[PDB]
Amino acid sequence: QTDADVIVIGAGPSGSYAAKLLHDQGVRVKLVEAKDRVGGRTWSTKSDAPGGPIDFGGQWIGETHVLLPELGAELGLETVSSVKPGNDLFVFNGDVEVGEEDQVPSGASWAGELSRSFELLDEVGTRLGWAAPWASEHVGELDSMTVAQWLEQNVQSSEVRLIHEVMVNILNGASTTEVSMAYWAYFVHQGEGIESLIGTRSGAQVAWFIGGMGQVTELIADKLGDDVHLNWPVTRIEQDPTGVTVFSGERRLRASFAILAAPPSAGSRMIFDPPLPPKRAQLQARAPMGRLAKIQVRYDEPFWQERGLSGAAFECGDLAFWLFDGSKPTDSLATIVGFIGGKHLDAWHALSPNEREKRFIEILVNNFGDKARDVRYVHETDWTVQPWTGGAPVTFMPTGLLSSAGSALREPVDRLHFAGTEAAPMWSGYIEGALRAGKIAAGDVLARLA
Amino acid sequence: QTDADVIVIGAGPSGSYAAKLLHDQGVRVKLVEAKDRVGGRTWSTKSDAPGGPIDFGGQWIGETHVLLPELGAELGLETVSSVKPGNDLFVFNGDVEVGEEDQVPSGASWAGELSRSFELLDEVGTRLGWAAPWASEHVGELDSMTVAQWLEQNVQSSEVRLIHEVMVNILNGASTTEVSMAYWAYFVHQGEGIESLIGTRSGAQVAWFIGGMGQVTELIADKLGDDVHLNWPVTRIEQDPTGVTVFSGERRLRASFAILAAPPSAGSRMIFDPPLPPKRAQLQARAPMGRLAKIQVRYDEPFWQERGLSGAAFECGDLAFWLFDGSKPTDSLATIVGFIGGKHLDAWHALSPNEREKRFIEILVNNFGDKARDVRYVHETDWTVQPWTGGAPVTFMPTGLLSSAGSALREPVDRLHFAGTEAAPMWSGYIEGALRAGKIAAGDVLARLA
Numbered sequence A, B: 001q002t003d004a005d006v007i008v009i010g011a012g013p014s015g016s017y018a019a020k021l022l023h024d025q026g027v028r029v030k031l032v033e034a035k036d037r038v039g040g041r042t043w044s045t046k047s048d049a050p051g052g053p054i055d056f057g058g059q060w061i062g063e064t065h066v067l068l069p070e071l072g073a074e075l076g077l078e079t080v081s082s083v084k085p086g087n088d089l090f091v092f093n094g095d096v097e098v099g100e101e102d103q104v105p106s107g108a109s110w111a112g113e114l115s116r117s118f119e120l121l122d123e124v125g126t127r128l129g130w131a132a133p134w135a136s137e138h139v140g141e142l143d144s145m146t147v148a149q150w151l152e153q154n155v156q157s158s159e160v161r162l163i164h165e166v167m168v169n170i171l172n173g174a175s176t177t178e179v180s181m182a183y184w185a186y187f188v189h190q191g192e193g194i195e196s197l198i199g200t201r202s203g204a205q206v207a208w209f210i211g212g213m214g215q216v217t218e219l220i221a222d223k224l225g226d227d228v229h230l231n232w233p234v235t236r237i238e239q240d241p242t243g244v245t246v247f248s249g250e251r252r253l254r255a256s257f258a259i260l261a262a263p264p265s266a267g268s269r270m271i272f273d274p275p276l277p278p279k280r281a282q283l284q285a286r287a288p289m290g291r292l293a294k295i296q297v298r299y300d301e302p303f304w305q306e307r308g309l310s311g312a313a314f315e316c317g318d319l320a321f322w323l324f325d326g327s328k329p330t331d332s333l334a335t336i337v338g339f340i341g342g343k344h345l346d347a348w349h350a351l352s353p354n355e356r357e358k359r360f361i362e363i364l365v366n367n368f369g370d371k372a373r374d375v376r377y378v379h380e381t382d383w384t385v386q387p388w389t390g391g392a393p394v395t396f397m398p399t400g401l402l403s404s405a406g407s408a409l410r411e412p413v414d415r416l417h418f419a420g421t422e423a424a425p426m427w428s429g430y431i432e433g434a435l436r437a438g439k440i441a442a443g444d445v446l447a448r449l450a
């Protein structure tokens, strides 16, 4: 006797979507979540911050994402463009260089090497591919070196190296010395290439949902009602020939199938009986979360526009950030959003909380003008202290893992299927990846219930 | 109101010893253990195997270890020498080279480069030291490269490279492509150097306890009686100004202090409120267990002695092992013990269980003679599937961790102290390290109770 046909573990976008798809087909589903809320790495509030709704977690929609805007449209949400006209900045240890709209500065001496370094990164990624990078002829050697070592071999310009460093520390939440070059190259390729992922007004960053991204999982949970269990951290998965028992301490739920819709690092904390096969076990233990904080400051007006700036900036150097204008037309304040990750977040963490705030305002004053001192609101979400997540924005892998265990990202283990963005064939790391992996896992389980 | 003055988490050698020291001073202690037994990475049975007691986990005592033999003597255990006269083997993809006792073969062409490679490894280790390798001027650069890259830069001989590869894959349970050179160099230095750790009849490998190493923790648990809780996996640690609450799901124990006597990977599965400081959090999430299996075959007689062989062998190549004669004079059969780790264990895992057994016998036949076919008993302990351990013999670290978070191996966090072998100033990775770290943590807490 089963409590459900399928138990979905994790109420992020991936698990929420998988649960919705199965529920919509008349499958009996339970959606179990460790935290006191749904959303996972997505997390927003309409009312808690002055100036309008605010997203603490992921919030950008990409121009080639289709499951995410289609689901948002089905749930009654509306999008708005994130595209901000004006010059992006490229800042090198506080030395401001003004872009031409989203392009490198007019006759920057590093423009040509940046272009070549992006072509070479794309080419390395193409050699790996997204379907089976672990099976690629090139992968063993690339997976034995770090991104930092690849930069030392292939990049001469300090500017180009600093741009690559901010992008790895943010997009993977980890230092170029910590990430496998094979993992990085694969990651960027499977996100439609480097220009896709680093777009300030194109590629992965073009739109938002009015009212916050957390609405996606909240509206799904409303419809699932009593089949959602919060404060239900999964501690043990048992499997036998007829089903799966999922435990939260002594609390237990029995189903025919289970979908793990959480990162490999989440899986590593659970006890499996029988034990997982070896590649999946190594993958869970050795693919950690990156580290990222999201800092937001609100103001009366997007005063950066007085210098004709977009508010986007590659803030490069020892305390690197990716900065955006996060303002919506429906908001009553303007927002600057800054991301800081990996080794730059380690430095950020070494500062006192008051030093961090003062330092972030000094950056904004340097880049955007003195009106940056006239703050209305200052907030940080440090993803490293979020219980049952412990990092952001994504899973990364150190040397030797992708080539030896990557095939375990996607493969079911008996009656346990993997969703979560890390299992998506493309757009792993993104909400779109979360939905595609949820779709895949719901379809696989639905075929096994028929 | 407290259930105890101190809760010790983990009944390996480290936690068992810390609990004993506090208990012996009249401190009220609870010792909580996830598994259905004590011992952790130590695990033995006097009666379950034919031919005498057998150790599934760690069992060697080193010639410079003093807490381990002193504790064994206090508990009424007896030691026996593990030293086996005769020629050790050096085998390169099945090509047998016969040592002179424990020394390289007479006029081996690789003898000189092996000697130089050991001096250079020792020198790199000395530059880091054991007291604070994370603070060493050299550490950032060494911690940005793998052991494999250091071998490619410093070692020319295929034989020397294959010896280094079997030693890293066994002593760290991980591939030379996965381990930071800084972590490896530090690890070997803090174990009194490479010759210490690779001794077949000297250094770290000279003696055993008659009746098995599991006796150490079992006899401690007998005296602690009802203050030992088995099947009590810690899921949450909460701290406040007056004490520590330790949870196993809804079950809870309150004390004034807590000692975590388990690897950083064990800590990563627990939820901390308040959250841990950042370096300790990164350390727990990113310092994984190695992978190791221990294969044992018993025979009527140590037939290898008919060729004048000790039974020790560096079995090098694509399926590498460290082999020992594991026979005690009090045993009624002779034992060959083989360790296989890291990338060699990945290959081992890719074979069927029957292929693995056939392959191990073919190795023994090649090295030691045809009488290796006349088996009495065959057993494997795969440490990767042991619940709440998930690996062996030790914690390792990938690039970038030791230099950025290593200072969190030893430092208390408010009322939570760290024991476990990984916190030992020297002999981290070893039972001796486990006892020294338990001693340190019990002394620190005892001073705070006074």
Ligand SMILES: Cc1cc2nc3c(=O)[nH]c(=O)nc-3n(C[C@H](O)[C@H](O)[C@H](O)COP(=O)(O)OP(=O)(O)OC[C@H]3O[C@@H](n4cnc5c(N)ncnc54)[C@H](O)[C@@H]3O)c2cc1C
Pocket: A009, A010, A011, A012, A013, A014, A015, A032, A033, A034, A035, A038, A039, A040, A041, A042, A056, A057, A058, A059, A060, A061, A232, A233, A234, A235, A261, A262, A263, A266, A267, A269, A292, A293, A294, A383, A387, A388, A389, A391, A392, A393, A394, A419, A420, A421, A422, A429, A430, A431, A432, A434
């Ligand atoms: C600061 C930040 C900014 C980002 N920006 C963007 C962006 O702009 N665009 C984009 O596309 N993506 C972005 N992302 C990434 C995006 O948030 C993730 O790709 C997405 O949320 C992944 O969805 P998921 O369902 O696979 O996993 P998660 O969102 O991580 O959900 C996993 C769920 O599983 C739960 N869980 C964990 N362990 C257990 C357990 N033992 N028992 C039960 N439940 C458990 C977790 O609590 C969580 O709710 C960002 C992320 C962060 C951190």
Ligand SMILES: Cc1cc2nc3c(=O)[nH]c(=O)nc-3n(C[C@H](O)[C@H](O)[C@H](O)COP(=O)(O)OP(=O)(O)OC[C@H]3O[C@@H](n4cnc5c(N)ncnc54)[C@H](O)[C@@H]3O)c2cc1C
Pocket: B009, B010, B011, B012, B013, B014, B015, B032, B033, B034, B035, B038, B039, B040, B041, B042, B056, B057, B058, B059, B060, B061, B232, B233, B234, B235, B261, B262, B263, B266, B267, B269, B292, B293, B294, B383, B387, B388, B389, B391, B392, B393, B394, B419, B420, B421, B422, B429, B430, B431, B432, B434
């Ligand atoms: C195959 C093998 C051979 C080895 N050979 C040798 C050798 O010859 N000589 C040598 O000196 N060393 C050897 N070792 C290493 C030695 O076994 C370890 O260094 C030693 O056991 C470490 O002791 P420890 O107490 O620090 O940790 P552990 O032995 O790992 O004990 C930790 C305990 O914490 C428990 N625990 C984990 N998570 C939780 C939780 N959430 N709640 C409660 N409890 C928890 C575990 O179950 C475990 O019992 C070997 C190890 C292996 C695997």
